[PDB]
């Protein structure tokens, strides 16, 4: 699971 | 900060080193004379590429590397080659007489004559580091230097640097391009000696790379230059997280955390995609979804093992180029559905992913198509143990008759050192079996 | 009981810490340079709680930024409000913690902890009357988890009569693929049961599910997850930041919320749930704020409150509304779902109403529940933990830093006790 502001 | 020193031992180590640093230069826009027009930080820098490259007043970007060989022919070609200006002469260290495919000569007879000089030059590089991360050691399993001297150096490095990380890129022997009958011997010896001195070792099976070059690139009889150029792309993928940085980038040490459940189980399986010719790549673009699928096709593995018959202990995906989180997440969802991929019961099943938006480049006159996006999967599977098994069997057949053992004894080794090394290998195969068993 | 000292440790800690200051600064009418430019005077009444004053009457956050790598803090300093923070209150190393609790708590972090406590001490002397500290951090990493709990243990030693508050981000495989996070979290929990008075259990499993299911974000980002945390943090501290009657300081909150010293792990909820893209043109009715704020969908902890019982509840309503109607709907839930509230704590639901609403909303409701259903969270981590520990997996990362298997067994044991303790009072 890829999650950057 | 977080500098990484590369050490290239022996012919394989050096020649692979050439391919790698050539490729690195092309990736960072560094000319063969070390100059880098992009870098405005003259004489210094804090950038991501500075972990592999130091800078000088002249504006010259110098590889944090050392090339060592007990015989000058191979390194001499570097000294006179296209990228001769890239290095400082003290970084290219040669002997006169090689180890004659003899581990004993590499570790003892010839190796002892040069080990201090090498360490002195390694030390001089370490002094340039604001915060050394560790070493990368490129070597062959089969060569006398690649096996014997590498073990000696790794042992010495454990002493002189304590527990700073030491990663291996080890060339596993293949009959199609084997140079010695005793490569099984050298392999088991170096593996045993280095095992407790290496934090993580990426095995490159030449037969696998030979196969991939023949199959995917339609190269009739692959040369070292062929294998190296493919190997370099893979090494580049693994070190991309160290040399570039973006929001979606995951440092190699983070992958390392997932990949090594026990100190001895530190041999990840590499699988790279897409390996495709320019002819096939024309008018055919490969999606994030497509390349991700290839990582689970054993034809694209770097070692000839069968993960299907084994169990998974970790899965990392090192993406580079045109890759977005959305597509990756959907891609793995597919594979979670379209494959089965069994994990051991004591590990979680998530895939640790990293992304570097910097796309893969290719060396001129290269065989590989220039693709928009690529991926390297690092997996910790019990199947890797197959590699040890094939090699341990070859070893067993010769040692049973003590074949060739006299060339080793004559240089100073003992039969005990052989049986000892072989017992460690038996324990390692046993270990790789233990982890696969279900819990109670 | 006046000044609060804020601390934020690690990547997660500094990100949510920054976002928290972004939000309340806007609510208190403080700009990035630190000058005041707001309408109402309610904004400056209890401004001294979280901010210090300087020459030119500039307002400086009472915040200490901690990390073992310069990454996030360099980004925060070049963030929106980056220049607001006291430059000297940036305390960072270079080695990093490598998502390792041991590195954060025993080796790499021990090498830096003393320097941080110097900044804590300097801020604590500027205080006319210190309440205590609020820490923001994740339990899944190394710095915030390991070094954070170390700072707590050390701070409790210098200020044992002060209140220790925490916003602790619980890990979830739905958000991170790092395998060792259950180790880090279990070790941290042990520290938190012993050395905090109040802990807001911000669960990344909840924040993700909220973002994906309710807010319909197919690829949730940290910014999306943090928008929820930021909203929660604003609401939970509203009773602290503006003039109020209920739970107006950390100790009073603790006395109302904590019936037993170890059971101080709160379940935060919020309504209306919002994304940075959501429009929110239609303000909700008071009944709607209430039905949602008690709805599991709005809980930030990923626990089903119907599986346990509420020991205590604090409810905070914001915006101009019928304070009459607030009481009726609040009394309605209690009387409707009376079975889910323990009978041996009469009137365990307390309510406050602040007039100033949060940024972008006219009507908002925040929830703070000490539910026994929180055990489901600790049960989740405990299982992820044992799955690995029964085979002693990945322990070499920790033993290499000097730890021993026994210290894991004790942390595992203590958190199993916590779960059982939460279960003891659920059947009372
Ligand atoms: N992939 C790849 N493998 C190589 C290359 N050069 C040598 N090898 C492999 O390395 C093994 C032999 O070891 P070498 O590295 O050539 O020997 P060495 O390290 O120079 O040690 P000595 O010559 O015995 O002192 C063979 O099995 C080769 O297949 C190379 O350039 N690329
Ligand atoms: N909500 C949220 N969680 C985060 C963020 N950064 C990291 N995390 C979580 O924190 C854990 C990793 O800890 P991290 O703060 O990165 O490590 P540290 O720097 O050593 O404290 C993982 O479980 C992440 O999901 C963030 O910005 N927001
Ligand atoms: Mg040679
Ligand atoms: Mg530079
Ligand atoms: Mg990180
Ligand atoms: Mg140090």
């Amino acid at each position: 699971x890829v999650x950057x502001x | 900060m977080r500098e990484c020193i590369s050490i290239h031992v022996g012919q394989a180590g050096v020649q692979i080193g050439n391919a790698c640093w050539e490729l690195y230069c092309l990736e960072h826009g560094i000319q063969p004379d070390g100059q880098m027009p992009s870098d405005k930080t003259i004489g210094g820098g804090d950038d991501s590429f500075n972990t592999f490259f130091s800078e000088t007043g002249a504006g010259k970007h110098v590889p944090r590397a050392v090339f060592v060989d007990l015989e000058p022919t191979v390194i001499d070609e570097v000294r006179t080659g296209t990228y001769r200006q890239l290095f400082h002469p003290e970084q290219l260290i040669t002997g006169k007489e090689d180890a004659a495919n003899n581990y004993a000569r590499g570790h003892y007879t010839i190796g002892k004559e040069i080990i201090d000089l090498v360490l002195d030059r390694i030390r001089k590089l370490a002094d340039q580091c604001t915060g050394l991360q560790g070493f990368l050691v490129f070597h062959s399993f089969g060569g006398g230097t690649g096996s014997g001297f590498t073990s000696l150096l790794m042992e010495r490095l454990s002493v002189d640097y304590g527990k700073k990380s030491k990663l291996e890129f080890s060339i596993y022997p293949a009959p199609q391009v084997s140079t010695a009958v005793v490569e099984p011997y050298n392999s088991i010896l170096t593996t045993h000696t280095t095992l407790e001195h290496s934090d993580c070792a990426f095995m490159v099976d030449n037969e696998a790379i030979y196969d991939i070059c023949r199959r995917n690139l339609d190269i009739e009889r692959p040369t070292y230059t062929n294998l190296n150029r493919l190997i370099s792309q893979i090494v580049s993928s693994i070190t991309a997280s160290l040399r570039f940085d973006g929001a979606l980038n995951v440092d190699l040490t983070e992958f390392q955390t997932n990949l090594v459940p026990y100190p001895r189980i530190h041999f990840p399986l590499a699988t790279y995609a897409p390996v495709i010719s320019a002819e096939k790549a024309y008018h055919e673009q490969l999606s994030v979804a497509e390349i991700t699928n290839a990582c689970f096709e054993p034809a694209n593995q770097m070692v000839k093992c069968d993960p299907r018959h084994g169990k998974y202990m970790a899965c990392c995906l090192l993406y580079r180029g045109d890759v977005v989180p959305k597509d990756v997440n959907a891609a793995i969802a597919t594979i979670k559905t379209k494959r089965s991929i069994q994990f051991v019961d004591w590990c979680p099943t998530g895939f640790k992913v990293g992304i570097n938006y910097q796309p893969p480049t290719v060396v001129p006159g290269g065989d590989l198509a220039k693709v928009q996006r690529a991926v390297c999967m690092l997996s910790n599977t019990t199947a890797i143990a197959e590699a040890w098994a094939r090699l341990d069997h070859k070893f067993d057949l010769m040692y049973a008759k003590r074949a060739f053992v006299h060339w080793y004894v004559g240089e100073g080794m003992e039969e005990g050192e052989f049986s000892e090394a072989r017992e460690d290998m038996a324990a390692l195969e046993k270990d790789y079996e233990e982890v696969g068993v279900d819990s109670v | 009981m006046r000044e609060i000292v804020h601390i934020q440790a690690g990547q997660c800690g500094n990100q949510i810490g920054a976002k928290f200051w972004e939000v309340i600064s806007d609510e208190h009418g403080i700009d990035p340079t630190g000058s005041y430019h707001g309408d109402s005077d309610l904004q400056l009444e209890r401004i001294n709680v979280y901010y210090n004053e300087a020459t030119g009457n500039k307002y400086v956050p009472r915040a200490i930024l901690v990390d073992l790598e310069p990454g996030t803090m360099d980004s925060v300093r070049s963030g929106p409000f980056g220049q607001i923070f006291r430059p000297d209150n940036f305390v960072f190393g270079q080695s990093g913690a490598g998502n390792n609790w041991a590195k954060g708590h025993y080796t790499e972090g021990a090498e830096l902890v003393d320097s941080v406590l110097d900044v804590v001490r300097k801020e604590s002397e500027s205080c006319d009357c210190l309440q205590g500290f609020q820490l923001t951090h994740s339990l899944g990493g190394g710095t915030g988890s390991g070094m954070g709990t170390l700072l707590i243990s050390k701070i409790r030693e210098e200020y044992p009569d002060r209140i220790m508050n925490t916003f602790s981000v619980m890990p979830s495989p739905k958000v991170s693929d790092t395998v060792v996070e259950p180790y880090n979290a279990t070790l941290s929990v042990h520290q938190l049961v012993e050395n905090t008075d109040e802990t807001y259990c911000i669960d990344n499993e909840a924040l993700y599910d909220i973002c994906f299911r309710t807010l319909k974000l197919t690829t949730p980002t940290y910014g999306d997850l943090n928008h929820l945390v930021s909203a929660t943090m604003s609401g939970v501290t509203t009773c602290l930041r503006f003039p109020g009657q209920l739970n107006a300081d950390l100790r009073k909150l603790a006395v109302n919320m904590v019936p037993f010293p170890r059971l101080h792990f709160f379940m935060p909820g919020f309504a209306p749930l919002t994304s940075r893209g959501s429009q929110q043109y239609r303000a909700l009715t008071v009944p709607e704020l209430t039905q949602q704020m008690f709805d599991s969908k709005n809980m930030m902890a990923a626990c089903d409150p119907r599986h346990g019982r509420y020991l205590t509840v604090a409810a905070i309503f914001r915006g101009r509304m019928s304070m009459k109607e607030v009481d009726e709907q609040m009394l309605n839930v209690q009387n409707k779902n009376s079975s889910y509230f323990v009978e041996w704590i009469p009137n365990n639901v307390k309510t406050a109403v602040c007039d100033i609403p949060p940024r972008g909303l006219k009507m908002s409701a925040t929830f703070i529940g000490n539910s026994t259903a929180i055990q489901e969270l600790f049960k989740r981590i405990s299982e992820q933990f044992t799955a690995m520990f029964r085979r002693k997996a990945f322990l070499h990362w920790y033993t290499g830093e000097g730890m021993d298997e026994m210290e894991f067994t004790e942390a595992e044991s203590n958190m199993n006790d916590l779960v059982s303790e939460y279960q003891q009072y659920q059947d009372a």
Side-chain angles (χ1 to χ4, degrees):
Chain A
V2 186
Chain B
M1 211 63 58
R2 295 176 157 84
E3 294 89 342
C4 298
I5 298 171
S6 304
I7 307 168
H8 304 284
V9 179
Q11 179 176 297
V14 164
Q15 292 187 149
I16 287 163
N18 277 120
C20 284
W21 284 105
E22 170 171 22
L23 181 57
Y24 290 166
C25 281
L26 300 182
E27 285 180 12
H28 296 300
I30 300 180
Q31 304 165 7
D33 78 326
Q35 303 294 327
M36 179 180 173
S38 308
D39 194 46
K40 305 316 198 309
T41 71
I42 311 303
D46 54 316
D47 302 279
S48 292
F49 62 82
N50 290 124
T51 59
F52 270 58
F53 291 87
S54 62
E55 295 196 45
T56 73
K60 184 170 152 130
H61 296 48
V62 185
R64 304 188 186 279
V66 176
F67 292 67
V68 191
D69 200 10
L70 305 182
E71 156 259 285
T73 310
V74 188
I75 287 174
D76 272 340
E77 269 294 316
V78 181
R79 287 163 175 157
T80 65
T82 315
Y83 290 81
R84 56 188 167 286
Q85 285 169 126
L86 196 66
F87 309 98
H88 183 291
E90 284 196 355
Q91 303 181 245
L92 310 183
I93 308 171
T94 54
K96 284 190 175 193
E97 190 184 7
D98 62 31
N101 295 320
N102 198 330
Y103 172 99
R105 292 178 63 86
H107 188 302
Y108 305 98
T109 308
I110 303 299
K112 66 191 166 55
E113 300 304 323
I114 193 163
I115 185 66
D116 285 330
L117 179 62
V118 174
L119 288 165
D120 177 90
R121 298 289 160 74
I122 291 171
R123 174 64 67 190
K124 278 177 183 185
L125 282 172
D127 295 345
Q128 293 186 338
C129 298
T130 67
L132 184 67
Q133 189 184 290
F135 312 87
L136 299 178
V137 182
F138 302 73
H139 64 101
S140 59
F141 271 167
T145 302
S147 66
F149 186 76
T150 297
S151 294
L152 177 64
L153 176 56
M154 291 278 282
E155 287 167 314
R156 289 289 296 267
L157 285 176
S158 287
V159 176
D160 292 25
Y161 295 86
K163 278 196 175 303
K164 263 182 192 277
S165 77
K166 287 189 275 294
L167 269 61
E168 289 175 90
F169 284 92
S170 299
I171 315 308
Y172 173 103
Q176 290 82 348
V177 293
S178 190
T179 65
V181 59
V182 297
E183 289 199 23
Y185 282 163
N186 293 332
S187 297
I188 274 74
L189 292 172
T190 183
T191 292
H192 163 58
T193 313
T194 304
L195 199 61
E196 66 188 358
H197 297 282
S198 181
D199 304 88
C200 181
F202 303 94
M203 289 194 294
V204 189
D205 186 0
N206 266 357
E207 193 162 2
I209 306 300
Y210 198 89
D211 284 341
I212 292 164
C213 279
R214 285 200 287 192
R215 195 199 318 106
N216 297 43
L217 299 183
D218 287 282
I219 295 167
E220 201 158 305
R221 203 290 189 178
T223 77
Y224 283 140
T225 306
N226 291 128
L227 308 177
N228 294 344
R229 280 184 165 169
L230 175 51
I231 289 171
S232 51
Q233 284 294 340
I234 302 167
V235 174
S236 176
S237 307
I238 296 180
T239 61
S241 53
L242 305 170
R243 295 181 291 105
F244 304 101
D245 201 30
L248 301 169
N249 185 42
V250 174
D251 199 82
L252 183 65
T253 66
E254 288 198 51
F255 296 125
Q256 210 169 316
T257 301
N258 279 17
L259 281 168
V260 189
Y262 311 92
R264 284 165 63 85
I265 314 301
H266 64 253
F267 301 91
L269 170 63
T271 318
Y272 178 90
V275 176
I276 191 170
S277 59
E279 281 89 336
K280 293 178 181 179
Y282 188 67
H283 280 1
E284 266 66 47
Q285 294 92 345
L286 296 96
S287 69
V288 168
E290 267 167 322
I291 57 174
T292 306
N293 305 331
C295 293
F296 293 85
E297 175 53 49
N300 294 314
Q301 285 169 201
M302 216 178 58
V303 180
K304 296 228 289 196
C305 53
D306 195 9
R308 309 165 184 161
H309 305 347
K311 284 172 174 179
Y312 278 85
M313 285 167 286
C315 264
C316 305
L317 297 171
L318 285 56
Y319 290 98
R320 75 189 309 182
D322 181 30
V323 182
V324 303
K326 167 174 67 67
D327 292 330
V328 178
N329 285 338
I332 304 177
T334 297
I335 293 173
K336 288 279 191 169
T337 299
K338 276 185 177 283
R339 297 306 215 291
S340 295
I341 311 167
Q342 195 195 14
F343 279 91
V344 292
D345 57 23
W346 48 273
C347 287
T349 67
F351 294 2
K352 191 139 178 77
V353 182
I355 303 175
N356 277 285
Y357 58 79
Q358 293 79 346
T361 191
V362 292
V363 175
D367 316 315
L368 247 180
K370 186 174 185 307
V371 297
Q372 276 181 305
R373 67 197 67 79
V375 63
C376 176
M377 183 182 86
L378 302 180
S379 58
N380 181 29
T381 173
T382 64
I384 196 76
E386 293 179 17
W388 307 131
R390 298 198 300 275
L391 222 55
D392 282 342
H393 184 51
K394 282 176 170 61
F395 175 102
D396 286 341
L397 283 178
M398 297 192 295
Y399 192 77
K401 315 293 178 292
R402 299 299 191 276
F404 299 97
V405 175
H406 76 99
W407 292 106
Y408 294 84
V409 175
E411 293 292 352
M413 289 184 66
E414 299 181 17
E415 283 194 351
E417 210 168 334
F418 273 71
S419 61
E420 178 183 283
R422 180 60 180 87
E423 270 153 25
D424 196 17
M425 292 306 301
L428 191 64
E429 282 198 48
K430 184 189 177 189
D431 291 337
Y432 262 93
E433 261 171 66
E434 287 177 350
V435 294
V437 182
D438 296 324
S439 307
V440 293
Chain C
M1 305 307 292
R2 194 205 316 282
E3 293 94 349
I4 296 167
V5 171
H6 170 98
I7 306 169
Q8 56 196 57
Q11 187 189 300
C12 182
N14 281 268
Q15 285 291 0
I16 70 176
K19 264 276 285 178
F20 158 80
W21 284 106
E22 270 177 43
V23 163
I24 69 164
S25 294
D26 161 88
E27 293 189 355
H28 287 256
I30 308 298
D31 83 83
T33 67
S35 312
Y36 175 83
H37 285 132
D39 40 20
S40 173
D41 270 23
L42 289 178
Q43 293 176 323
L44 284 162
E45 195 131 308
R46 300 170 78 186
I47 194 74
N48 288 318
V49 175
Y50 279 99
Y51 298 76
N52 288 313
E53 261 193 317
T55 53
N57 299 96
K58 282 203 171 183
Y59 296 92
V60 177
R62 195 169 302 101
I64 306 168
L65 302 84
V66 183
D67 207 338
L68 284 167
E69 59 189 0
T72 309
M73 274 168 61
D74 289 342
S75 65
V76 164
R77 176 157 35 210
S78 294
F81 283 67
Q83 320 291 23
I84 205 174
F85 299 97
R86 207 169 178 280
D88 307 271
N89 289 19
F90 287 77
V91 188
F92 60 89
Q94 293 282 332
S95 62
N99 298 322
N100 191 323
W101 192 89
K103 278 184 178 289
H105 195 88
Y106 283 134
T107 67
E108 303 290 342
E111 199 175 334
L112 185 66
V113 67
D114 276 23
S115 326
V116 181
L117 290 164
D118 286 336
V119 182
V120 175
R121 195 171 301 96
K122 187 182 65 56
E123 291 294 350
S124 297
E125 273 153 21
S126 160
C127 286
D128 182 26
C129 191
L130 178 75
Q131 325 189 24
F133 316 84
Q134 75 176 18
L135 168 68
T136 60
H137 69 304
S138 61
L139 299 194
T143 304
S145 187
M147 203 190 166
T149 52
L150 180 69
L151 284 160
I152 289 169
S153 196
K154 298 250 177 178
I155 283 171
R156 199 191 183 189
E157 195 174 13
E158 283 201 49
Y159 309 93
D161 62 338
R162 303 297 80 153
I163 298 295
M164 182 55 58
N165 185 80
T166 67
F167 296 87
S168 305
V169 181
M170 314 304 190
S172 172
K174 293 190 186 181
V175 174
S176 176
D177 295 282
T178 307
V179 300
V180 296
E181 298 206 353
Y183 282 161
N184 299 338
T186 304
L187 289 162
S188 288
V189 166
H190 191 170
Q191 299 289 297
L192 294 174
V193 175
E194 303 291 335
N195 298 321
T196 66
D197 301 279
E198 298 158 326
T199 292
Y200 296 101
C201 291
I202 297 168
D203 192 347
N204 266 9
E205 190 151 298
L207 297 179
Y208 181 85
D209 284 344
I210 284 175
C211 278
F212 183 73
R213 300 174 180 171
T214 303
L215 298 173
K216 300 296 179 192
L217 300 166
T218 41
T219 309
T221 75
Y222 281 130
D224 296 330
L225 269 49
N226 286 345
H227 172 80
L228 298 185
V229 175
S230 204
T232 305
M233 286 186 68
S234 175
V236 136
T237 64
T238 300
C239 20
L240 304 172
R241 288 182 298 109
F242 297 100
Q245 294 289 326
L246 179 78
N247 298 331
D249 71 71
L250 293 170
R251 190 161 242 106
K252 252 159 176 180
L253 173 65
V255 172
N256 286 342
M257 290 302 297
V258 183
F260 310 97
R262 292 162 56 89
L263 311 180
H264 53 270
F265 295 98
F266 305 149
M267 220 179 73
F270 187 88
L273 286 177
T274 286
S275 69
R276 295 173 297 176
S278 83
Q279 321 209 75
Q280 295 302 319
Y281 298 140
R282 171 169 176 156
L284 285 72
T285 72
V286 171
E288 283 172 345
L289 280 177
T290 300
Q291 240 65 3
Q292 292 177 26
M293 84 190 302
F294 275 82
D295 197 328
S296 316
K297 301 178 185 127
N298 290 66
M299 300 300 172
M300 304 290 168
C303 301
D304 193 5
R306 290 184 306 160
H307 295 183
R309 315 184 69 200
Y310 292 106
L311 302 173
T312 61
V313 181
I316 305 89
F317 295 78
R318 307 190 64 182
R320 293 164 50 126
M321 85 199 71
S322 169
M323 198 178 298
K324 178 192 198 287
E325 196 175 11
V326 172
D327 290 316
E328 323 194 350
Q329 285 302 288
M330 279 307 311
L331 287 170
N332 157 76
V333 177
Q334 287 185 80
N335 297 330
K336 151 59 162 47
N337 294 327
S338 60
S339 44
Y340 296 119
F341 298 78
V342 294
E343 66 276 3
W344 43 273
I345 303 182
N347 317 116
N348 52 324
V349 190
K350 299 282 161 180
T351 311
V353 180
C354 172
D355 285 343
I356 301 186
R359 182 64 179 203
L361 293 167
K362 280 182 171 66
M363 305 272 288
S364 94
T366 305
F367 176 87
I368 316 175
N370 194 331
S371 167
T372 64
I374 193 66
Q375 73 181 279
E376 296 185 342
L377 182 143
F378 297 113
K379 253 164 169 185
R380 190 182 79 210
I381 306 293
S382 191
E383 265 150 59
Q384 298 179 359
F385 173 99
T386 298
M388 297 184 289
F389 189 70
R390 63 182 168 178
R391 299 292 287 270
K392 305 289 174 288
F394 301 99
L395 279 177
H396 76 93
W397 297 120
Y398 297 89
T399 61
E401 299 296 315
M403 283 188 64
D404 178 85
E405 298 187 357
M406 188 61 64
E407 188 167 338
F408 280 76
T409 301
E410 292 172 6
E412 179 206 56
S413 179
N414 187 44
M415 188 172 70
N416 287 319
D417 292 335
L418 183 73
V419 167
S420 63
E421 288 169 40
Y422 263 115
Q423 186 66 50
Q424 178 178 3
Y425 299 108
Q426 173 172 313
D427 301 328

